[PDB]
UniProtKB/Swiss-Prot annotation:
Subunit structure: Component of the commander complex consisting of the CCC subcomplex and the retriever subcomplex. Component of the CCC (COMMD/CCDC22/CCDC93) subcomplex consisting of COMMD1, COMMD2, COMMD3, COMMD4, COMMD5, COMMD6, COMMD7, COMMD8, COMMD9, COMMD10, CCDC22 and CCDC93; within the complex forms a heterodimer with COMMD6. Interacts with VPS35L; the interaction associates the CCC complex with the retriever complex. Identified in a complex with an E3 ubiquitin ligase complex composed of TCEB1/elongin C, CUL2, SOCS1 and RBX1; in the complex interacts directly with SOCS1 and CUL2.
Location of this chain's protein in the cell: Nucleus; Cytoplasm; Endosome membrane; Cytoplasmic vesicle
Tissue: Ubiquitous. Highest expression in the liver, with lower expression in brain, lung, placenta, pancreas, small intestine, heart, skeletal muscle, kidney and placenta. Down-regulated in cancer tissues.
Interval of the full protein contained in this chain: 1 to 108 of 190
Key words of the record: Acetylation, Copper, Cytoplasm, Cytoplasmic vesicle, Endosome, Lipid-binding, Membrane, Metal-binding, Nucleus, Protein transport, Transcription, Transcription regulation, Transport, Ubl conjugation, Ubl conjugation pathway
Name of the featured protein: COMM domain-containing protein 1
Naturally occurring in which organism (per UniProt): Homo sapiens
An example Gene Ontology molecular-function term: protein homodimerization activity
């Protein structure tokens, strides 16, 4: 209640974004210890994993696997069926992992 939400909607929305630790070589902008400070300054660069226990499946999918739209859409169903998993509040922002960058992007 007072610790089961992770800041708010801002982090969960840019979680898979911050988590970007190993893209291909490592950008001078994003960093492992930076991902937390990026959106979740409350979580430490060590106790972040336990929270990712429900936000890690998407990490290895976008970062370690790098997927596209229509591919992760069906993957999120796993985040809402797994042992406990996340709630409709979280799945709401995560399900956007491919629409947040494929809507008002180039507009065509």
């Amino acid at each position: 209640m007072a610790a089961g939400e992770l800041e708010g909607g801002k982090p969960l929305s840019g979680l898979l974004n911050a988590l970007a630790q190993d893209t291909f070589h490592g950008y001078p902008g994003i960093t492992e210890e930076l991902l937390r400070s990026q959106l979740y300054p409350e979580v430490p660069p060590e106790e972040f994993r336990p929270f990712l226990a429900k936000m890690r499946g998407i990490l290895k999918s976008i970062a370690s696997a790098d997927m596209d739209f229509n591919q992760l859409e069906a993957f999120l169903t796993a985040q809402t069926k797994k042992q406990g998993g996340i709630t409709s509040d979280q799945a709401a922002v995560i399900s956007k992992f491919w629409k947040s960058h494929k809507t008002k992007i180039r507009e065509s």
